[PDB]
Write a protein that binds this ligand. Structure first.
Ligand code: ZN
Length: 199
């Protein structure tokens, strides 16, 4: 009955993918206990750094990527949930189920990637395990893995970035394209589609 109805939890930043040096690596900033409490209160006092965040819900863990002052991720992971912040749960600034895209204002202390202007088709996918996978762009919204892998390796990487050779943001990883469970290609949200949503 109505008095007993719970509320959806907040997305919680539980770590980041460090790309600021010569070596990419994942860092955890909050354990599962703190994540649970933070998800319920929506209050996160942790300092955020970097461009690529690891985020969790009650059920899922995936990625969120800051581009031009917006932290972007996929609707099929975050739905309409708020994200926890130092002042409380923060409401989504963008919500587009048709693009499978959501976004919040980038957390204070985060760094944003710059949208790519190069038109290059040699791309690099950053995974939740700090893999940097070469990807050849094949369309506005798809690239092919130079070395196909089992889908397991890409699980939980939605919302991660596809990068230009110069480190610009080219797209947000949306979902893998598989055959017999083997990921041979990836579909992503082009950054141009993000810029249009941003006006
Ligand atoms: Zn570029």
């Amino acid at each position: 009955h109505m008095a007993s109805m719970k509320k959806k939890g907040s997305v919680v930043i539980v770590g980041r993918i460090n790309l600021s040096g010569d070596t990419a690596y994942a860092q955890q900033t909050r354990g599962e206990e703190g994540c649970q409490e933070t998800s319920q209160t929506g209050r996160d006092k942790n300092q955020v750094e970097g461009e690529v965040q690891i985020v969790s819900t009650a059920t899922q863990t995936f990625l969120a990527t800051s581009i031009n002052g917006v932290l972007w991720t996929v609707y099929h992971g975050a739905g309409t949930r708020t994200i926890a912040s130092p002042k409380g749960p923060v409401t989504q600034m963008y919500t587009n189920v048709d693009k499978d895209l959501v976004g919040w204002q980038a957390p204070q202390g985060s760094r944003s990637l710059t949208p790519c202007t190069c038109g290059s088709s040699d791309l690099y996918l950053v995974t939740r395990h700090a893999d940097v996978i070469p990807v050849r762009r094949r369309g506005d919204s798809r690239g092919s893995l130079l070395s196909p892998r089992p889908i397991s390796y890409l699980k939980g990487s939605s919302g991660g970035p596809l990068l230009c050779p110069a480190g610009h943001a080219v797209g947000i990883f949306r979902t893998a394209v598989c055959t017999r469970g083997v990921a041979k290609a990836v579909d992503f949200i082009p950054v141009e589609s993000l810029e249009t949503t941003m006006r």
